[PDB]
Design a binder for this molecule. Sequence first.
Ligand SMILES: *[C@@H]1O[C@H](CO)[C@@H](O[C@@H]2O[C@H](CO)[C@@H](O[C@@H]3O[C@H](CO[C@H]4O[C@H](CO[C@H]5O[C@H](CO)[C@@H](O)[C@H](O)[C@@H]5O)[C@@H](O)[C@H](O[C@H]5O[C@H](CO)[C@@H](O)[C@H](O)[C@@H]5O)[C@@H]4O)[C@@H](O)[C@H](O)[C@@H]3O)[C@H](O)[C@H]2NC(C)=O)[C@H](O)[C@H]1NC(C)=O
Ligand SMILES: *[C@@H]1O[C@H](CO)[C@@H](O[C@@H]2O[C@H](CO)[C@@H](O[C@@H]3O[C@H](CO[C@H]4O[C@H](CO[C@H]5O[C@H](CO)[C@@H](O)[C@H](O)[C@@H]5O)[C@@H](O)[C@H](O[C@H]5O[C@H](CO)[C@@H](O)[C@H](O)[C@@H]5O)[C@@H]4O)[C@@H](O)[C@H](O)[C@@H]3O)[C@H](O)[C@H]2NC(C)=O)[C@H](O)[C@H]1NC(C)=O
Ligand SMILES: [Zn+2]
Ligand SMILES: [Zn+2]
Lengths: 160, 160
Amino acid sequence: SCVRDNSLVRDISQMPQSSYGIEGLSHITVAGALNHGMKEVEVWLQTISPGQRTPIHRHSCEEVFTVLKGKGTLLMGSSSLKYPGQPQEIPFFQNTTFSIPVNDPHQVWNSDEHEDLQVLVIISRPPAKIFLYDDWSMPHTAAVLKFPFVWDEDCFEAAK
Amino acid sequence: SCVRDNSLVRDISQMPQSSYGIEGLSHITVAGALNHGMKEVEVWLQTISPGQRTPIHRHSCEEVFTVLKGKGTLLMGSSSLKYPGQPQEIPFFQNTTFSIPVNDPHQVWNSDEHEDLQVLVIISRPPAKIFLYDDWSMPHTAAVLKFPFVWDEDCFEAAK
Ligand SMILES: *[C@@H]1O[C@H](CO)[C@@H](O[C@@H]2O[C@H](CO)[C@@H](O[C@@H]3O[C@H](CO[C@H]4O[C@H](CO[C@H]5O[C@H](CO)[C@@H](O)[C@H](O)[C@@H]5O)[C@@H](O)[C@H](O[C@H]5O[C@H](CO)[C@@H](O)[C@H](O)[C@@H]5O)[C@@H]4O)[C@@H](O)[C@H](O)[C@@H]3O)[C@H](O)[C@H]2NC(C)=O)[C@H](O)[C@H]1NC(C)=O
Ligand SMILES: *[C@@H]1O[C@H](CO)[C@@H](O[C@@H]2O[C@H](CO)[C@@H](O[C@@H]3O[C@H](CO[C@H]4O[C@H](CO[C@H]5O[C@H](CO)[C@@H](O)[C@H](O)[C@@H]5O)[C@@H](O)[C@H](O[C@H]5O[C@H](CO)[C@@H](O)[C@H](O)[C@@H]5O)[C@@H]4O)[C@@H](O)[C@H](O)[C@@H]3O)[C@H](O)[C@H]2NC(C)=O)[C@H](O)[C@H]1NC(C)=O
Ligand SMILES: [Zn+2]
Ligand SMILES: [Zn+2]
């Protein structure tokens, strides 16, 4: 169900979390467009289980991650080639931050075997317009837009 | 000092931290316009000591707080009448979030007697253009622009 909250101060621990089908993910939309009426920034809290990954994707917005707990590897592909290509692998750890250049293909992986990875994520121009890649070899022109994204599907249908 | 860095993964524990002369404040720009090249979002990490208050201010941007540690009181006035008016005073605590509507005059007060309040603050349209009120009866047209704000001064001067 779509959970909307017009309240000013909200307890994040009482905002409903779900994997939405992404195995090993736990997502909460802390302050968003469809759930709370944001227009310029939207904030997520996500936990990713040991060894799990976000899909390979891009989005036309800025995106900033702040690592609250755990560690992992950020996989970055090319925006200059016609496809992402074999990715650069950049380790990250607790209390680091990283900004994804607008539109770059990337993937976040909990490469740690021992503990959960928890990140606060912020995007501009919400809600998110995510294009999914099946692999680093897939051309940018073939990536598929999945809008609404899984955590917006309920409110997007509800708004109709 | 102005510490520029566009490095993709950055360690928050090593970034410059200062009160910038604001008693009881501790500030780090985690991801910002002038320091790091952001264009649409900017993230601050701030610690506010017991009993301290931010100035009463407004800024024409969205702004979302997430409370990492501690508790406090949010004071909010209106942007539609000629002055802010007697403010709403809403308690907040660890793991809560609040978003300030565009241009609402507000104040964040660490009303706890003993613990530090630590918040992540996210803003749109950076850097911040903050207008300061001396009290809740000061008319909106009289509020004073302080730009650049103290944590942007050094990098603002260096980017001329
Ligand atoms: C502010 O409040 C925040 C909200 O409460 C809080 O953050 C929450 O903190 C809790 C406590 O640590 C976290 O809970 C932890 O979640 C992780 C990660 O979870 C997900 O992955 C698991 C593990 O998975 C794999 O193996 C299982 C076998 O069990 C398979 O099924 C699976 O396919 C994988 O191979 C998975 O089971 C989870 O799934 C279920 O749960 C989701 C949602 O809960 C449902 O949608 C789903 O259908 C089913 O119920 C899920 O995908 C887990 O690994 C830990 O053991 C523990 O549960 C929350 O994740 C975390 N929330 C977020 C959004 O981060 C903050 O910590 C708090 N902060 C402060 C400052 O106080
Ligand atoms: C990710 O990394 C982050 C960065 O390391 C980290 O966050 C930092 O965490 C540390 C450790 O907990 C915090 O340090 C604590 O800071 C508090 C608050 O400090 C400020 O207030 C004090 C107290 O002020 C009042 O009392 C004094 C008298 O003692 C009076 O003078 C004053 O007027 C008030 O009445 C004040 O002394 C502090 O000032 C000094 O320090 C600043 C630098 O911060 C100088 O600029 C200043 O000139 C002067 O030397 C300051 O105003 C302090 O009370 C604690 O004792 C301790 O120092 C950091 O604040 C915090 N940083 C931020 C930005 O939040 C994260 O926790 C880490 N996260 C993870 C997950 O690991
Ligand atoms: Zn992304
Ligand atoms: Zn503010």
